[PDB]
Amino acid sequence: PKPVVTAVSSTMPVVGSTVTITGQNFIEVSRVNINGEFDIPVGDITTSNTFDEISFVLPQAPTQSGHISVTAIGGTVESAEIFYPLENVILNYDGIGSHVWGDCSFVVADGSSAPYVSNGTCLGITGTVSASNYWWKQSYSNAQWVNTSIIPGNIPIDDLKLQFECFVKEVFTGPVFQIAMCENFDAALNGYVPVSSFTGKTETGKWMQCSVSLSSVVADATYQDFLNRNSTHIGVYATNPGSSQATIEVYFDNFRIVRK
Ligand code: NA
Ligand code: NA
Questions:
Q1: How does it sit in the bilayer?
Q2: Ligand nearest to C-alpha 256
Q3: Residue 96 to residue 94: CA distance in whole angstroms
Q4: Distance in angstroms (rounded) separating the CA atoms of residues 182 and 217
């Protein structure tokens, strides 16, 4: 019985954070290879009772994109998603894209306070916001859109998704996020609360991958049409339409556009 991979917790997990892989027949896992660059020590791999899940801490960043390969007693299987799709990152605040203006913070995690680990600099939206507040903290940034050598111009927007890593300290009630691109606010995603692509829940106290259809923030038919808006704007805006004051602490990194 061959091993099978059904899902991976993130395509770009933060170094020092837990990677979880779900699937079947993870029996006597003898190797987990990351992007043909390094192996996870077998002793550092945790396997569930029913052999349907493995997890491990990512010890270092791959330098190139690739896939995860899992060897079990039944054979070897490769994850279908591209792992560490570095070429798909549009904004990381460390040389891909840049912050232009906004009330927000930028942090390099220090191992002692949230978000504890980071891949370099991340965006912070943190602090206390009054009830019914429609302009609070935000970042207006310039993205570096994915090259058409990676995503051809004729790919439908319907076939693409926006992914990013997010850390939420504690759940909150009231505050929401807007994500907008190319100053097309009519097409923006509004009222968004970060939820995990892996669990469907707002995970707290750890990084999660968040994913939305690119059509939820882009109105154009194809990727080329989107590029021809001739704007590198990407904006992340926090407000609080709730009836109570709230304090939140949310971090973002590695915005990326990938194929569904
Ligand atoms: Na970063
Ligand atoms: Na352009």
A1: Lipid-anchor
A2: 1
A3: 6
A4: 10
Closest ligand to residue 144's CA:
2
- Cα 181–chain centre separation: 17
179 touches 257 (CB < 8 A): no
Show the domain range for 47.
Answer: 4-78
Could you tell me the CATH number of the domain that includes residue 60? 2.60.40.10
DSSP 66: B
Named by the residue before each, gaps in the chain exceeding 2.5 A from C to N are none
User: How far is the C-alpha of 255 from the C-alpha of 163, rounded, in Å?
Assistant: 6
Determine how many CB atoms are found less than 10 A away from the CB of residue 46.
13
Could you tell me if 218 and 231 are in contact, meaning their C-beta atoms sit under 8 angstroms apart?
Answer: no
Q: Which two tokens stand for residue 2?
A: 């061959």
The DSSP H or E segment spanning 259 is strand 246-259
First to last CA, the chain: 28
Q: How far apart are CA 255 and CA 199, in angstroms?
A: 19
Q: Compute, in angstroms, the gap from residue 151 CA to the centroid of ligand 2.
A: 14
